[PDB]
């Protein structure tokens, strides 16, 4: 369903920006706890586990929903590494986040929790919703007039909208065009390790 | 190796190498425990481990271990025996679940908190 913990501790443990601008994680880059300073018994096991945990904790996705992502990626005709990154870049909250309309992944998580978004005319309170190409996207007025959402929409100096997403008016219409391409995603650390580990 | 001789006979696996013998491959059975006398583990692992012999409902007489520190079971007890593997003891391949039919969970167990029948601390 949904996780509980914040992102700073996981950022420190996995040693990567999970908030994106976590002041406290770069304050304490070592893993949390009395022995984040203490050196770890290094293993490629740890490398792959850290990679998958970064992937899970970056987007707000959670483990059981993540495993079926790999499985369906492997079922896809293309190489599993490509398909997994494509589909993880194909989530409803991900689609609305990359448009710069949500300041956090948890922003979009709680937004789809509340029901502040609309795809093709149908309201989907389900973050696990899949948004296809050429989908019509809109934002409801009750959230539109809300003050922090007004800040998010009007101060949208956040990360730029990728070429496969297009906010095309004041209605926050994200007229999606194509799939998230490998040459266009600009993804964090790759996922070939996940494919090789899960395939065994 | 003489393909025709294969047609004559051959190609069987070696041996099942069975593990569980309570009955029915039961995820657990229940029965009456007795002979709860403590015996000795292996010499390098010098200690003493509390065990018992349980006649399960499966009509077989097996040897079960009593995990944890404290025990609640005594003679004529409805103990639930599960399969186990104790290399520390000779011929002991069973345990009794704590926080279950008869044996109360191990007192104040907190590192496991699911095993040893230690319920949630309020």
């Amino acid at each position: 369903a949904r996780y509980t913990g914040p992102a700073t501790r996981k950022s420190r443990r996995l040693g990567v920006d999970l908030v994106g601008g976590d002041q406290s994680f770069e304050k304490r880059p070592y893993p949390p706890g009395q022995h984040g300073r203490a050196r770890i018994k290094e293993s490629e096991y740890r490398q792959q586990l850290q990679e998958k945990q970064k992937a899970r904790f970056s987007y707000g996705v959670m483990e059981k929903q993540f495993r079926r992502y790999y499985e369906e990626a492997n079922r896809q005709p293309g190489k599993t590494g490509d398909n997994l990154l494509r589909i993880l870049e194909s989530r409803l909250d991900n689609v609305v986040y990359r448009a710069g309309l949500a300041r956090t992944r948890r922003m979009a998580r709680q937004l789809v929790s509340h029901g502040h978004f609309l795809v093709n005319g149908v309201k989907v309170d389900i973050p696990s919703y899949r948004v296809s190409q050429y989908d019509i996207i809109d934002v409801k007025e009750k959230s539109l007039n809300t003050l922090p959402f007004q800040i998010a929409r009007e101060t949208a100096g956040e990360r730029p909208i990728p070429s496969w997403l297009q906010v095309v008016g004041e209605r926050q219409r994200i007229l999606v065009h194509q799939l998230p391409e490998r040459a266009q995603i600009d993804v964090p650390l790759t996922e070939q390790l996940i494919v090789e580990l899960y395939s065994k | 190796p003489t393909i025709q001789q294969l047609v004559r006979k051959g190609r069987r696996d070696k041996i099942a190498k069975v593990k569980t013998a309570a009955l029915k491959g039961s995820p657990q059975r229940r029965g009456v425990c007795t002979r709860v006398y403590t015996t000795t583990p292996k010499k390098p692992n010098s200690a003493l481990r509390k065990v018992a012999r349980v006649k399960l409902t499966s009509q077989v007489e097996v040897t079960a271990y009593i995990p944890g520190e404290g025990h609640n079971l005594q003679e004529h007890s409805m103990v639930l025996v599960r399969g186990g593997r104790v290399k520390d003891l000779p011929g002991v391949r069973y345990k009794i679940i704590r926080g279950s039919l008869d044996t109360q969970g191990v007192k104040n167990r907190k590192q496991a908190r699911s095993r040893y029948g230690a319920k949630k601390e309020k």
Partner: protein
């Protein structure tokens, strides 16, 4: 004897039906000799798609549609062919036209710019 039947399919709240031809002594979901149609009360137009000439044959040899199956036949006008009393005509309604997959985004782009 022989009867043309409606058999149930789909999940719980939304019913669907296949128009089959079968013996009475079977159950509702036995071996269909031939699937000759399909119908769904759940969908808007109760849309029906029927193999026509096989139904013509089976009516000829003496297939006896079930009461709602016969109702569906009339809803098609098929019973107006084997019996042919007024002649066969399109009697069933249809799903509304509805836009396409591409024209939706075409209109969205036109509205946007």
């Amino acid at each position: 004897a022989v009867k043309i039947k409606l058999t149930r399919l789909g999940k719980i709240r939304n019913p669907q039906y296949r128009i089959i031809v079968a013996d009475a002594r079977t159950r509702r979901d036995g071996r269909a000799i031939e699937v000759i149609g399909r119908y769904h009360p759940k969908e808007e137009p109760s849309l029906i798609q029927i193999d026509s000439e096989r139904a013509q044959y089976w009516l000829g040899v003496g297939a006896q549609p079930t009461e709602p199956v016969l109702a569906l036949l009339k809803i098609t006008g098929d019973w107006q062919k084997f019996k042919g009393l007024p002649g066969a005509e399109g009697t069933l309604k249809v799903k509304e036209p509805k836009p396409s997959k591409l024209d939706l985004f075409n209109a969205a782009l036109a509205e946007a710019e």
